[PDB]
Amino acid sequence: MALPIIVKWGGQEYSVTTLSEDDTVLDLKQFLKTLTGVLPERQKLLGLKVKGKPAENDVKLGALKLKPNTKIMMMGTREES
Numbered sequence: 001m002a003l004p005i006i007v008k009w010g011g012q013e014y015s016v017t018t019l020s021e022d023d024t025v026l027d028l029k030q031f032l033k034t035l036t037g038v039l040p041e042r043q044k045l046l047g048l049k050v051k052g053k054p055a056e057n058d059v060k061l062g063a064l065k066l067k068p069n070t071k072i073m074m075m076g077t078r079e080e081s
Contacts, residue, residue, distance in 0.1 A: 005061060006071030007045070009036040013071070021068045026057030036074060043076020 048064035
């Protein structure tokens with residue numbers, strides 16, 4: 001099954017519908033990153049830190065981030081493409 005996820009960036013809103021929160025941060029972030037322009041390699045989605053790390057890329061969403069239907073906030077800056 002697929003778990004949707006809402007992302008917030010600069011007042012913008014973008015939901016996901018390709019993978020599940022139990023997939024991986026880099027998996028979801030990469031998706032919204034194309035709609036927001038900002039990648040996870042620069043910033044991280046508002047959530048929690050595991051093993052002392054700011055939710056690595058291999059770190060699942062529902063792991064520390066939050067629920068699927070729940071929306072997350074993007075803290076950081078976009079990359080220069």
